[PDB]
Design an enzyme around this catalytic site. Structure first.
Site: not given
Length: 279
Positions: A16, A39, A69, A161, A175, A177, A200, A224, A260
């Site tokens: 937390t 990827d 990657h 990014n 919207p 995913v 999300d 990513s 947080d």
């Protein structure tokens, strides 16, 4: 179960507060679920995958990850030392070339492949898809992510990014995913992390140590890298039976570390992915 001296993002999603170093996770560890890494590929021969990784589709002359990657992100999903769900199955879908790039048509074809290929796999705990890739807005790339998500696969995509609103990026803006933003070890939105209302969840995305090609490791940054943190967690939560493919994103956002995160623009959720593990 606990992993000492875990990468900070593994320790983060099991805590937390920031700053910690031990990754706490139920021993099930995502066993019985499958995550399709979409990827540059995976070096399944990496001892860190312990044989639980394999290529299932390439769109190039080789299925070998010559970029690193895809190996890195699959390492964050289910590698032994750098992974969220350490007993999960890892299926490589190489829709990015060895330069990290890739056509929209190819990325759509990969998502349609995963939506069909899963029907040939053994994933009784469900199927996740990790999409460590970005691009401009596209109604067609969005439709592919939506299809795959609706075919029964938990789809996690990077916000991108660009330090901009994620609404101008696909599949980030689809919207249905799970659009994942990135955070750093001091509970900040990563400097590069896209944001907006379509996001999300946020995952650890800055200086993420994970597997790398050649049998090596390297720490890199990007939304990513936040995506396989969430895809793995989805696989972990799904194996535990706490959620399913169609609801894992919502379940992760409701169970998240709320509020947080520093430097979250107005109207972007302030949620940090969290497994809420009690032993």
């Amino acid at each position: 179960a606990a992993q000492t001296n875990a990468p900070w993002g593994l320790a983060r999603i099991s805590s937390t507060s920031p700053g910690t170093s031990t990754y706490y996770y139920d021993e099930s560890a995502g066993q019985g679920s499958c995550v399709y890494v979409i990827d540059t590929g995976i070096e399944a021969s990496h001892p860190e995958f312990e044989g639980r990784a394999q290529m299932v589709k390439t769109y190039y002359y080789s299925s070998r990850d010559g970029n690193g990657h895809g190996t890195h992100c699959a390492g964050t999903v289910g590698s032994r030392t750098y992974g969220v769900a350490k007993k999960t199955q890892l299926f490589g879908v190489k829709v990015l070339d060895d330069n990290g790039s890739g056509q929209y048509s190819t990325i759509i074809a990969g998502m349609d492949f995963v939506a069909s290929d899963k029907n040939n796999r053994n994933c009784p705990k469900g199927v996740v898809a990790s999409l460590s890739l970005g691009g401009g807005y596209s109604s067609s790339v969005n439709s592919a992510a939506a299809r795959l998500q609706s075919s029964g696969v938990m789809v996690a995509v990077a916000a991108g990014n660009n330090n901009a609103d994620a609404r101008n990026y696909s599949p980030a803006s689809e919207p249905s995913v799970c659009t994942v933003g990135a955070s750093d070890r001091y509970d900040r939105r990563s400097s590069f992390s896209n944001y907006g209302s379509v996001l999300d969840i946020f995952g650890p995305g800055t200086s993420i140590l994970s597997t790398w090609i050649g049998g090596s490791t390297r720490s890199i940054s990007g939304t990513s890298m936040a995506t396989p943190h969430v895809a793995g967690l989805a696989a972990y939560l799904m194996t535990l039976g706490k959620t399913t493919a169609a609801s894992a994103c919502r379940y992760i956002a409701d169970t998240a570390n709320k509020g947080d995160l520093s430097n979250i623009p107005f109207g972007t959720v302030n949620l940090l992915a969290y497994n809420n593990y009690q032993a």
